[PDB]
Amino acid sequence: DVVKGNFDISKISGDWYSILLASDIKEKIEENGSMRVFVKDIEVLSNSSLIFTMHTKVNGKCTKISLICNKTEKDGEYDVVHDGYNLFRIIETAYEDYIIFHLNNVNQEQEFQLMELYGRKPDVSPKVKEKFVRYCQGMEIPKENILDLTQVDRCLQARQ
């Protein structure tokens, strides 16, 4: 049951796994990239806030970080502060299997967008994955800038 709007935030809480990562600036999502983070779980703080738990590599070690995200005026949109100011929203989700996030980072230097595909399990059908790829292309993210994380160290060995 795909959902493209009016999302039940409580039903996207819990564990997620970071499968595909995309950006119009590839350095942001390659190794050592400011945006190469691996989601661990999403939880509802309040009627209007979220807390993301994610892993990043710090001196070679998987390291847990927390990010507070607040709902904004536009529906489904959130904002967060990681290497600049970020606005993100759900593109679509199947609550039990996958979710697609679009993020926009606005900074002094150079504005850029992010696309992320999470799964309830460390992978999803290639049907879901290429719907994601077509999304990225429609948003003019080059296919060269889409990274499959299923075959990289995404800190799964550190989720607890």
Numbering used by the authors: 6 to 165
What does the paper say about this structure?
Lipocalins are small proteins, usually composed of less than 200 amino acids. There are 7 sequentially named dog component allergens, Can f 1 through Can f 7 and 4 of them are lipocalins: Can f 1, Can f 2, Can f 4, and Can f 6. Therefore, Can f 6 is a major allergen driving disease amongst those people who are allergic to dogs.
The recombinant Can f 6 crystallized in space group P3121 with one monomer in the asymmetric unit (ASU) and was refined to a resolution of 2.06 Å. The overall architecture of Can f 6 contains a highly conserved lipocalin fold of an 8 stranded anti-parallel β-barrel enclosing a central ligand binding cavity core, a four-turn C-terminal α-helix that packs against the β-barrel, and a short 9th β-strand (βI) at the C-terminus. There is a disulfide bond between residues Cys69 and Cys162 that connects the C-terminal part of the protein to the central β-barrel. Can f 6 crystalized as a monomer reflecting the method of purification, on size exclusion chromatography at pH 8 where the protein of correct size was identified and further purified. In the structure of Can f 6 there is unmodeled electron density inside the highly hydrophobic ligand binding cavity which is uniquely shaped. Unique to Can f 6 is His87 of L5 that closes the L1 loop over the ligand space via a hydrogen bond to the backbone carbonyl of Ser39 in L1. The calyx cap conformation in Can f 6, places Met40 of the L1 loop over the ligand cavity where it does not make significant internal interactions. IgE reactivity verifies the antigencity of recombinant Can f 6.
